[PDB]
Amino acid sequence: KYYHANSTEEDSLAVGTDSLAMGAKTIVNADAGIGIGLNTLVMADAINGIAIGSNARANHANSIAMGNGSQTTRGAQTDYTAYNMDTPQNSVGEFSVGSEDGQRQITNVAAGSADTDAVNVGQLKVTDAQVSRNTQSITNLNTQVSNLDTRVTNIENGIGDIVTTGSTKYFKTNTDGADANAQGADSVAIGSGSIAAAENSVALGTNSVADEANTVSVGSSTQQRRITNVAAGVNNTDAVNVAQMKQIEDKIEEILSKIYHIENEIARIKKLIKLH
Amino acid sequence: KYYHANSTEEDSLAVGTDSLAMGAKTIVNADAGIGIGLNTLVMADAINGIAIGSNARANHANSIAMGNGSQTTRGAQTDYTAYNMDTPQNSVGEFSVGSEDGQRQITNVAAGSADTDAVNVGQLKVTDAQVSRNTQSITNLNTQVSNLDTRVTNIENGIGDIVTTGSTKYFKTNTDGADANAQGADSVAIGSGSIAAAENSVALGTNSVADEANTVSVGSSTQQRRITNVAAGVNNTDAVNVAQMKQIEDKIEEILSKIYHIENEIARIKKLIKLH
Amino acid sequence: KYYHANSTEEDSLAVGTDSLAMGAKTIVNADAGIGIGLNTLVMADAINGIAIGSNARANHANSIAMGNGSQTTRGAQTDYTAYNMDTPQNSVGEFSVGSEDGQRQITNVAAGSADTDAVNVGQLKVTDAQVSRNTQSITNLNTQVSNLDTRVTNIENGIGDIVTTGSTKYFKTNTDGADANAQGADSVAIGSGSIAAAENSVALGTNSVADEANTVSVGSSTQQRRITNVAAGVNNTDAVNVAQMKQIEDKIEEILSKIYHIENEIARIKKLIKLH
Ligand SMILES: [Cl-]
């Protein structure tokens, strides 16, 4: 003998056809069932079912109950929803290392190769080590993303009007018309359809045409602009106003009136020379 | 018999109460222990412990040692730190397919449904296939994020001053005062508190008021501006300077002096006509 | 006896040295092999190999076949490529709960601690719950990233020219030369190297110098600018043009010619007084 079993209680019952029943109180019923240990049971229609260890209940068909007081709790499944799997799954049985009120760890596993090999904590730690980089990057991206929201909306607040009015706080305008132009070299222009033309010129105003070299127009041939609030020229190069003109205009007036009386002077002389 | 064991060495010892001891040299001590195979041992307080296969050592209580020279290396645990799990865990035993110096693969596993079913490489490959999309996206985001840092900081370098001075490289200013205005239609304005008013006008300068139609002010009623470095008008519409004024002013001078002597001419005649 | 086996067919063969053979038709050949159940086989060089349950084939060395009609399908491996693992792996055997045409679930597993403990669906669900946050964030980032592409490229389209020409649609220019300047306080300037100098002034034009208080230059000492299309001043402060000048110029002309004949008048009188 090389099969010893130190017990005295009710004997093993290998009942089902071609069973196998070992240890005290071990009833085995499912055909081709196997029960090993103290008080194990392989129930009725648990075809080919195995219960190995104290109080182990092989409940299901083709499935297994391993270790003290483990049950089978599922059995073979058909077209079942496996976690993460995109298409119905199938199972020919179950291998249970536990029960409803007690699970066990599975220890000392080499990593996995085939898709139907078991995975281990070490293999999972590689994913998590990645996820946690994608994680930390997403935060590092969030701030970058946020700071560029506070940076851009400074531009659209700092600028903004320069698009609309086409101006700045010290360079306003109020126009709907066509776009301005600096045709000739070195030129400047201002206002609606402001056609500069000649060299070094300036077409200052809505629809103004400076079409001669070095000039500074304030209008066109038909529409022409006055120049208000101007000072009386001092240097030879300074512009002259009406206050200085009128002064001349009135100076002419004296001249005419002095001359008026001179001619009435000379008529009288001439009258007298014929007379006296 | 349907239980054969081709051996000759020391006999199986099923020592502990209700043990089970099979194969040569197989000592079994833990109560309700089970040892099957060559030279297996279920030690002292390895209650309900199973050692199945060559030199297999069931060391712990309620746990299992499966396969040639596997040991149990943990046993049931209490409030233990499981990987990735957020709350203490519990274990009623261990199922070992190996030992310190040799682990095994677990093969031919259907995917997992319940949270306490084993996971397989295929199920993990679904996560990794995702992670690696989040991964590649994060890179695709990084460049986009970076290129918009080099794009925006061109705007704040290309522009920048237009916020500060309210100007461009050919349109400067130096003012702290209030904002300019183009009140009337078609108008333009320039400088601190530059109040344009009338139609088509221009209020050129810090605090300048062009309040009449089509005009071009360079000041207000009290403060008024000269116009330096101006050319002598040629066309009927061109502005006139002092160089052309003085020339008139001096032309008047001749006129007065010629006239001065004319009147001293006429006095003498008149003197003589009374005389001779 | 506590080892019962209800059968009648061909007897168990424990052939290999120190084998163990249980149940009908169970041939066991590998040395130290163990076969338990109906029609199990532990083949030739399946050293220490275990086949437990109906038609179970222990094919490989040191490996295991568990449950009705499971095979070993790999055996111990050497320097093998494990999924996700960065360095060759090793395995001392295999623990099979299935075969080519039928896998099983492993149920009732406590989570995993060591790197070589089995992982369970619950432990994987923690990773996926994260991944799916990194996922949803990446989408939330994508839109943010995209909307800031449509926001910035409005700025470079809304602005754009203001960098190039240094202007707006109503404030043009055409110059390559040096940058403008508002040296003195309260000042404005316009054009290439436009050197304003005095207070409240304006240096309107490419290379123009307004170097006196409150003035409005349109050039420098050598280069000086005309002012085309100007209106005839009305108020005392309004600029005067040639149309008003010429009118004076011609008014002088009358004055001279009236005076020409006055002097030829007076010569004749004087001639006559000597004569008659
Ligand atoms: Cl991720």
In which residue are the tokens 């050592």 written?
A: B57
Q: Are B15 and A6 in contact (CB under 8 A)?
A: yes
Residue C162 contacts A, CB cutoff 8 Å:
yes
- Maximum distance among all alpha carbons in chain C? 192
DSSP letters of A115-181? TTBBPBHHHHHHHHHHHHHHHHHHHHHHHHHHHHHHHHHHHHHHSSHHHHTS--TTS-B---SPPPE
Burial B218-233 (b: 16+ CB within 10 A, else e): bbbeebbbbbbbbbbb
Closest Cα in chain C to B8: C18
CA B40 to each of CA A141, B56, B131, B212: distance values in angstroms, whole numbers, following the listed order = 58, 5, 45, 116
Chains with 3 or more CB pairs under 8 A to chain A: B, C
Residues 6+ apart with CB under 8 A from C98: A92, A93, A116, B107, B108, B109, B110, C67, C70, C71, C104
In which residue are the tokens 């009147």 written?
A: B263
Give the separation between CA B182 and CA B193, rounded to whole angstroms: 10
DSSP assignment letter at B112: -
Q: How far is C29 from chain A (nearest CA, A)?
A: 18
Paired tokens of A133? 């980089």
Residue from the list A48, A180, A239 with its beta carbon closest to the beta carbon of C68: A48
Closest CA to C109 of B147, B192, B119: B119
**Pairwise CB contact (< 8 Å): C90 & A110:** yes
Closest CA to B119 of A135, C213, A109: A109
β-bridge mates for residue A22, sequence order: A36, C3
Closest CA to B92 of B119, B66, B60, B118: B60
Paired tokens of B163? 């916020």
Cβ-based neighbour number of residue C143 at 10 Å = 9
**Pairwise CB contact (< 8 Å): B229 & C225:** yes
User: Counting beta carbons within 10 angstroms of the beta carbon of residue A80, is it exposed (0 to 12), middle (13 to 18) or buried (19 or more)?
Assistant: middle
Give the separation between CA A88 and CA B113, rounded to whole angstroms: 12
Give the separation between CA B227 and CA A256, rounded to whole angstroms: 32
Question: How many CA atoms, within 13 angstroms, populate the side-chain half-sphere of residue B102?
Answer: 18
Chains with 3 or more CB pairs under 8 A to chain B: A, C
Ligand 1 centroid to residue A223 C-alpha, Å: 71
- The helix/strand/coil state of B164 is helix
The two beta strands, C202-204 and B13-14, are: unpaired
Q: Are C117 and A117 in contact (CB under 8 A)?
A: no
Closest CA to C73 of A91, B99, B103, B106: B106
User: Counting beta carbons within 10 angstroms of the beta carbon of residue C126, is it exposed (0 to 12), middle (13 to 18) or buried (19 or more)?
Assistant: middle
Residue B156 contacts C, CB cutoff 8 Å:
no
Give the separation between CA A115 and CA C82, rounded to whole angstroms: 11
Give the separation between CA B258 and CA B252, rounded to whole angstroms: 10
Residue C267 contacts B, CB cutoff 8 Å:
no
Give the separation between CA B196 and CA C31, rounded to whole angstroms: 111
A242-275 helix and C242-275 helix, angle to the nearest 10 degrees: 20
Residue C267 contacts A, CB cutoff 8 Å:
no
Side chain identity, residue C170: Y
Paired tokens of A265? 């002077």
β-bridge mates for residue C69, sequence order: none
Give the separation between CA B102 and CA B91, rounded to whole angstroms: 23
- At residue C93, what are phi and psi to the nearest 5 degrees? 165, -175
Give me Rg for the CA atoms of chain B: 56
Q: How far is A215 from chain C (nearest CA, A)?
A: 5
Residue from the list A53, A98, A276 with its beta carbon closest to the beta carbon of B50: A53
Q: Are A193 and A220 in contact (CB under 8 A)?
A: no
Instruction: Find residues 26-65 of chain C whose CB sits inside 8 Å of chain B.
Output: 26, 32, 34, 36, 47-48, 50, 52, 62-64
Paired tokens of C132? 């799916």
DSSP letters of chain C? --EE----SSPPEE-STT--EESTT-EE-STT-EEESSS-EE-TT-TT-EEESTT-EE-SSS-EEESTT-B--S-S-SSB--TT-SS-B--S-EEES-BTTB-BEEE-B----STTBBPBHHHHHHHHHHHHHHHHHHHHHHHHHHHHHHHHHHHHHHSSHHHHTS--TTS-B---SPPPEE-STT-EEESTT-EE-STT-EEESTT--B-STT--BSS-SSS-B---SBPPP-STTSB-BHHHHHHHHHHHHHHHHHHHHHHHHHHHHHHHHHH-
Q: How far apart are the first and last CA of chain A?
A: 192
Ligand 1 centroid to residue C246 C-alpha, Å: 88
Which ranges constitute the DSSP H helices of chain B? 121-158, 161-164, 242-275
Q: In what order do the strands lie in the sheet with C41-42?
A: C13-14, C27-28, C41-42, C57-58
Residues 6+ apart with CB under 8 A from B268: none
Give the separation between CA A75 and CA A60, rounded to whole angstroms: 5
Give the separation between CA A174 and CA A191, rounded to whole angstroms: 9
Closest CA to C54 of C24, C74, C28: C24
Q: Are B199 and B214 in contact (CB under 8 A)?
A: yes
Q: Are B215 and B196 in contact (CB under 8 A)?
A: no
Ligand 1 centroid to residue C112 C-alpha, Å: 22
Cβ-based neighbour number of residue A34 at 10 Å = 32
Closest CA to B85 of A81, C119, A130: C119
Closest CA to C97 of A22, A116, A28, A115: A116
Closest CA to C49 of C90, C82, C89, C92: C92
Q: How far apart are the first and last CA of chain C?
A: 192
DSSP letters of A257-273? HHHHHHHHHHHHHHHHH
Ligand 1 centroid to residue B129 C-alpha, Å: 10
Give the separation between CA B56 and CA C155, rounded to whole angstroms: 76
Closest CA to B126 of A276, A272, A184, A82: A82
Closest Cα in chain C to B83: C113
Q: Which contacts qualify for A138-141: CB closer than 8 Å, 24 or more apart? A: A138/B138, A138/C134, A138/C137, A138/C138, A138/C141, A141/B138, A141/B141, A141/B142, A141/B145, A141/C141
Q: Which contacts qualify for A22-26: CB closer than 8 Å, 24 or more apart? A: A22/B20, A22/C2, A22/C3, A22/C4, A23/B18, A23/B20, A23/B34, A23/C2, A24/B18, A24/C2, A26/C2
Closest CA to C34 of C13, C19, C46, C44: C19
Closest Cα in chain A to B216: A227
Residue A247 contacts B, CB cutoff 8 Å:
no
Residue from the list B66, B117, B227 with its beta carbon closest to the beta carbon of C105: B117
Q: How far is C72 from chain A (nearest CA, A)?
A: 12
Give the separation between CA A276 and CA B172, rounded to whole angstroms: 81
Q: Are B130 and A127 in contact (CB under 8 A)?
A: no
Q: Are B158 and A146 in contact (CB under 8 A)?
A: no
In which residue are the tokens 């809304």 written?
A: C158
C121-158 helix and B121-158 helix, angle to the nearest 10 degrees: 20
Q: What structural domains does chain B harbor? A: 1-159 (2.150.10.10), 160-276 (no CATH)
Side chain identity, residue B233: G
CA C210 to each of CA B36, B245, C70: distance values in angstroms, whole numbers, following the listed order = 112, 22, 103
Give the separation between CA B205 and CA C186, rounded to whole angstroms: 9
Give the separation between CA A21 and CA A45, rounded to whole angstroms: 16
User: Counting beta carbons within 10 angstroms of the beta carbon of residue B15, is it exposed (0 to 12), middle (13 to 18) or buried (19 or more)?
Assistant: middle
- Maximum distance among all alpha carbons in chain A? 192
Residue C139 contacts A, CB cutoff 8 Å:
no
Side chain identity, residue B15: V
In chain B, what are the helix, strand and coil shares in percent, each to the nearest 5? 30, 20, 55
Residue from the list A20, A135, A248 with its beta carbon closest to the beta carbon of C36: A20
Give the separation between CA B35 and CA B58, rounded to whole angstroms: 8
The dihedral built from the CA positions of residue B196, B201, B203 and B208, taken in this order, carries a sign that is negative
Question: How many CA atoms, within 13 angstroms, populate the side-chain half-sphere of residue B140?
Answer: 12
Residue from the list B1, B159, B230 with its beta carbon closest to the beta carbon of C227: B230
C121-158 helix and A121-158 helix, angle to the nearest 10 degrees: 20
Question: How many CA atoms, within 13 angstroms, populate the side-chain half-sphere of residue A58?
Answer: 38
User: Counting beta carbons within 10 angstroms of the beta carbon of residue B273, is it exposed (0 to 12), middle (13 to 18) or buried (19 or more)?
Assistant: middle
Q: Are B204 and B217 in contact (CB under 8 A)?
A: yes
Give the separation between CA B180 and CA B206, rounded to whole angstroms: 9
**Pairwise CB contact (< 8 Å): C111 & B83:** yes
Residue from the list A3, A134, A231 with its beta carbon closest to the beta carbon of C134: A134
Give the separation between CA A36 and CA A22, rounded to whole angstroms: 5
